[PDB]
Design a protein around this motif. Structure first.
Motif, PDB file in Angstrom:
ATOM      1  N   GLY A  71      76.965  79.737  30.484  1.00  0.00           N
ATOM      2  CA  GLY A  71      77.852  78.645  30.167  1.00  0.00           C
ATOM      3  C   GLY A  71      79.053  78.598  31.082  1.00  0.00           C
ATOM      4  N   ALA A  72      79.787  77.504  30.992  1.00  0.00           N
ATOM      5  CA  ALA A  72      81.112  77.456  31.581  1.00  0.00           C
ATOM      6  C   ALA A  72      82.091  78.194  30.676  1.00  0.00           C
ATOM      7  CB  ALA A  72      81.555  76.009  31.784  1.00  0.00           C
TER       8      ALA A  72
ATOM      9  N   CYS B 197      81.206  77.414  37.981  1.00  0.00           N
ATOM     10  CA  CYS B 197      81.285  76.861  36.632  1.00  0.00           C
ATOM     11  C   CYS B 197      80.269  77.503  35.693  1.00  0.00           C
ATOM     12  CB  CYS B 197      81.094  75.345  36.679  1.00  0.00           C
ATOM     13  SG  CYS B 197      81.291  74.501  35.100  1.00  0.00           S
ATOM     14  N   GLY B 198      79.011  77.581  36.107  1.00  0.00           N
ATOM     15  CA  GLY B 198      78.012  78.178  35.243  1.00  0.00           C
ATOM     16  C   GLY B 198      77.229  79.301  35.885  1.00  0.00           C
ATOM     17  N   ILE B 199      77.885  80.098  36.721  1.00  0.00           N
ATOM     18  CA  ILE B 199      77.236  81.147  37.495  1.00  0.00           C
ATOM     19  C   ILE B 199      77.977  82.454  37.258  1.00  0.00           C
ATOM     20  CG2 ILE B 199      76.553  81.911  39.776  1.00  0.00           C
ATOM     21  CD1 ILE B 199      76.651  78.856  40.532  1.00  0.00           C
TER      22      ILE B 199
END
Ligand SMILES: [K+]
Ligand SMILES: [K+]
Ligand SMILES: [Mg+2]
Ligand SMILES: [Mg+2]
Ligand SMILES: [Mg+2]
Ligand SMILES: [Mg+2]
Ligand SMILES: [Mg+2]
Ligand SMILES: [Mg+2]
Ligand SMILES: [Mg+2]
Ligand SMILES: [Mg+2]
Ligand SMILES: [Mg+2]
Ligand SMILES: [Mg+2]
Ligand SMILES: [Mg+2]
Ligand SMILES: [Mg+2]
Lengths: 248, 93, 97, 99, 76, 134
Positions: free
Chosen positions: B66-67, B51-53
RNA sequence: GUAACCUCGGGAAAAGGAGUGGCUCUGACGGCCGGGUCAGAACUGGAACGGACGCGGGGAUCCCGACUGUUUACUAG
RNA sequence: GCGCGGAGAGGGGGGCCCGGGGGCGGACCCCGCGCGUCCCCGGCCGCCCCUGAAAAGCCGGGGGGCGCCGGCCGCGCGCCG
RNA sequence: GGGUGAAGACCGGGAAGGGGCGUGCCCGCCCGUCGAACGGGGAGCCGGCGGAGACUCCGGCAGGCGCGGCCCCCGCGGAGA
């Protein structure tokens, strides 16, 4: 009647959080003598995904200060943090995104995350993806500082409480529709047993105060008082008003 | 655009969810499938892992972003504000 | 023969990843079953996750002492590339520091 | 304000230069470079190594005002360039905008 | 089972490490009228194939009474 | 604008079995078709440790020193700001490092020379271990 | 060869036509012998060939629920 | 199908791993060819508001302290289904 | 250790909570030889024999892990991988 869904949830059983395969509890570094005087340096080792959580977590390694070896921590990652970066914690930490320092040393107008309400509690205030707090003002006479919470409320905390520079990573997650019933199923399968939801007016009288009747309808007003006893508190609890007002 | 006029990547949904959802998904999915320039080596090799990586396929450096997109405007505003407030303090000590 | 069907060789018949066989012809013109053992991974680098050269994919207990070593100061813990960075970083830092 | 862009174009037209870090180290070690130009996103450990070697050979070292992509464009190239060394400026190149 | 070379055959017989020696005469196919020497050792069974029958007599005569000997000479 | 690879310089080995050890350049070979090489002599093992107990029989062994001599790629070295004046160039040359017995003789000679310098407390930086925090 | 309508993705196998066996041949596609498949022609059988088997009937509309999903084990899907 | 390259491509010369194959032993091996099926493995690519166990046990590296540690030959391996 | 309840019992981190080598010293906050004949796990193949047993018997050929004797050594090669 019998016991309602809300009453059955409180007793655990099939209503506990699914915690298998979770990395652990995310927390700020503990406060000690070394960083009450100077700064302690660490290195970001990995950025990982936590089951059930929307924001990523970072593994940070610090030197051991009461012996030999190293100490592994687990932070909530601010946006812009990268693997191999080195971060500082302490009264003399510099104003960079990943650093941890007390709020008294943070200039007004700064974004902070993972703030701790009381000194030495290891963070509790802005921890969900995309959130942040703002430092509003200082008061050197009383040694208290005012912050603004993500909900918009304003709070006073002691100036010795620590925080992290930046905002939580993963912002924007709720802008995308789930679209399908199968997506909500996976989302809640990572967290707890709470989905799907059956409406109260669709039940029989024996298991909800809203059930029964020859047409589906709530018999009385849905606003209940603050002092309703546990089996009664369903609907809108102590509502100040109802409906779509439209103004500010 | 030889195969479709407007659905684009939302053609995998057939006729099953409505126009508003499909438009929003078009925007978000186009953003989240894209390739981004790496801030450490100026190459367009950054892709989403979770998701945020975000990870770089060249240098192998992992970032928290961010996503659906590597950068968000609130984050840029916050970084600029921090950078400004950092210099004012260091002039007067 | 017109029938080549065999029977299970293990205690139970449930096919898990540690219960795989292959078939071979024996000297008595019979079809037999032989276990397929799992192959372990060779050691991987600490700084990076890449595999370390020179060590085979066998459990260390069945290797001689020389066969599980590399002739370098940090041999078997990090690769040659990762060792250079540590040497360069320590020297350049201690010279300025 | 001013352009150090004219100097690069003339050196690329009539001079002798090398693009890359390995060639740069091999030249500086040998006492054959007259100037080393470096981008602002070069990796820090290579930065330290090249700085220290330039110090040990009394070579001038300057930093460029862009990324390796910008430098690669400024030398008329379609790939990133982290380290550039000029071995011989041209009779049209005035290596006097930096040193 | 493993193959053995000629020089370290009667050496093994010298250190009294062989427990028995068998001589078998092969006379069909790629084993054309050659003989195989099979020596039983504590750990392994070692076998050598002398390229010609004559070489067998010399070596076996070179270890006679040092290790017990069998003969096969299957002719079927 | 001056070359830095010259005899007497102190470098650091970055590759091979002796990586991370210090060495001195004694002869810079001329560039050929295999690249740039040089002949170096370096400490293979430092003088161990001696304390107050002073057991002579074990003390002598603990105070022993080892060294290596060989040519190596100049790309595999890190030149430094130090110097170490010596005169090994007389018995050290290309043809005297190709053969083995000569190499062993040179090794013992360099070992003896190093031991002295250690005793008289000279060249402290050269005879020290470079800390590495891998 | 395929209409109205449409959230432009569908509707759609829309609707609706024609051919298909056996035998004797022709061409096309690889490699430094192998392989099947696709296409075309003559002749010939009660005007017969997916010859058993396996395997959508279609269209025009109105009401209700958007859709995939779940339900009264033993009379309600 | 992709993908990679000045943070070093192509070329030439090398090293490592590869649940496999060949030769000789085990054991005095009829000779060639081919489409497909099943199982296992490999390198890629795609997907997730879903990221896809743990421990015993075994081994390596750094620092310190110590010292034959391998070869041959002999013995042994309990309880329960 | 304890806490609570008329008890039966139920609840539980804040408690002077163990070892080693070998006799003196040193190290050390705090449970489980409970729970998987499908998960992890050091090592087995062929031929033959009975009336009813076999990866277990016999013949052959191997593996693993220990113990006891005799000899029995504290590193060299590569430019680098
Ligand atoms: K509901
Ligand atoms: K079990
Ligand atoms: Mg009902
Ligand atoms: Mg009621
Ligand atoms: Mg009703
Ligand atoms: Mg090896
Ligand atoms: Mg329905
Ligand atoms: Mg249905
Ligand atoms: Mg029924
Ligand atoms: Mg029914
Ligand atoms: Mg148990
Ligand atoms: Mg098992
Ligand atoms: Mg047996
Ligand atoms: Mg039976």
């Amino acid at each position: 009647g019998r016991r309602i869904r809300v009453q059955r949830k409180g007793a655990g059983s099939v209503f506990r959080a699914h915690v298998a395969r979770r990395l652990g509890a995310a927390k700020l570094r503990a406060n000690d003598f070394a960083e009450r005087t100077g700064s302690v340096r660490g290195v970001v080792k990995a950025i990982l995904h936590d089951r059930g959580r929307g924001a990523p977590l970072a593994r940070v390694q610090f030197p051991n200060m009461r012996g030999e070896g190293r100490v592994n921590e687990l932070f909530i990652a601010p946006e812009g943090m990268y693997t191999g970066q080195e971060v500082f914690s302490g009264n003399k930490a510099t104003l960079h995104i990943g650093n941890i320092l007390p709020v008294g040393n943070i200039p007004e107008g700064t974004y902070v995350c993972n703030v701790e309400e009381k000194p030495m509690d290891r963070g509790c205030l802005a921890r969900a993806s995309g959130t942040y707090c703002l430092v509003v003002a200082h008061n050197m006479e009383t040694n208290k500082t005012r912050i603004r919470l993500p909900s918009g409320q304003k709070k006073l905390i002691s100036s010795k409480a620590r925080a992290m520079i930046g905002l939580v990573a993963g912002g924007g997650r709720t802008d995308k529709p789930l679209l399908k019933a199968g997506n909500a199923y996976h989302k809640y399968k990572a967290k707890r047993n709470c989905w799907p939801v059956v409406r109260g007016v669709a039940m029989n009288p024996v298991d909800h105060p809203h059930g029964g009747g020859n047409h589906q309808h709530i018999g009385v007003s849905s606003c209940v008082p603050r002092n309703a006893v546990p089996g009664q508190k369903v609907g809108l609890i102590a509502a100040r008003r109802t409906g779509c007002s439209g103004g500010k | 655009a030889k195969r479709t006029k407007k659905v684009g990547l939302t053609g995998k949904y057939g006729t099953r969810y409505g126009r508003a959802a499909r438009k929003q998904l078009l925007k978000i999915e186009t953003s989240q499938k894209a390739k981004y320039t790496c801030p450490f080596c100026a190459k367009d090799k950054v892709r989403r892992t979770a998701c945020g990586i975000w990870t770089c396929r060249s240098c192998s450096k992992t970032m928290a972003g961010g996503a659906y997109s590597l950068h968000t405007e609130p984050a840029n505003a916050a970084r600029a504000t921090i950078r400004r407030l950092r210099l004012a303090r260091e002039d007067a000590q | 023969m017109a029938d080549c069907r065999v029977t299970c060789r293990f205690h139970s018949t449930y096919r898990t990843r540690s219960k795989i066989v292959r078939y071979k012809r024996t000297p008595g013109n019979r079809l037999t079953s032989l276990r397929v053992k799992k192959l372990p991974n060779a050691p991987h680098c600490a700084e990076t996750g890449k595999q370390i050269h020179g060590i085979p994919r066998v459990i260390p207990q069945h290797l001689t002492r020389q066969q599980r070593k590399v002739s370098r100061p940090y041999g078997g813990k990090l690769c040659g590339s990762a060792l250079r960075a540590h040497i360069l970083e320590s020297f350049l830092n201690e010279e300025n520091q | 304000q001013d352009s150090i862009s004219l100097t690069l174009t003339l050196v690329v037209k009539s001079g002798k230069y090398t693009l890359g870090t390995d060639q740069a180290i091999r030249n500086i070690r040998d006492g054959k470079a007259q100037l080393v130009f470096m981008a602002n996103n070069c990796p820090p450990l290579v930065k330290s190594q090249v700085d220290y070697l330039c110090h040990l050979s009394k070579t001038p070292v300057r930093v460029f005002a862009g990324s390796s992509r910008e430098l690669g464009i400024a030398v008329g190239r379609q790939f990133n360039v982290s380290i550039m060394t000029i071995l011989e400026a041209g009779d049209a190149d005035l290596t006097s905008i930096l040193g | 089972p493993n193959t053995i070379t000629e020089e370290n055959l009667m050496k093994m017989i010298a250190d009294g490490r062989g427990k028995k020696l068998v001589v078998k005469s092969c006379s069909k196919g790629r084993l054309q009228g050659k003989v195989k020497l099979k020596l039983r050792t504590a750990k392994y069974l070692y076998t050598l194939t002398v390229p010609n029958a004559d070489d067998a007599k010399s070596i076996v005569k070179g270890c006679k009474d040092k290790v017990e000997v069998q003969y096969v000479n299957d002719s079927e | 604008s001056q070359p830095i690879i010259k005899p007497g310089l102190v470098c650091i080995v970055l590759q091979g079995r002796h990586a991370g050890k210090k060495a001195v350049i004694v002869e810079a070979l001329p560039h050929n078709e295999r690249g740039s090489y040089a002949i170096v002599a370096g400490i293979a093992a430092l003088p161990r440790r001696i304390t107050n107990s002073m057991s002579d029989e074990e003390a002598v062994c603990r105070g022993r020193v080892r060294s290596f001599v060989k040519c190596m790629n100049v790309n595999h070295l890190m030149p430094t700001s130090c110097r170490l004046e010596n005169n090994y160039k007389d018995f050290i040359s290309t043809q005297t490092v190709a053969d083995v017995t000569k190499r062993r003789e040179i090794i013992e000679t360099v070992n003896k020379d190093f031991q002295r310098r250690i005793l008289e407390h000279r060249d402290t930086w050269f005879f020290t271990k470079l800390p590495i925090d891998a």
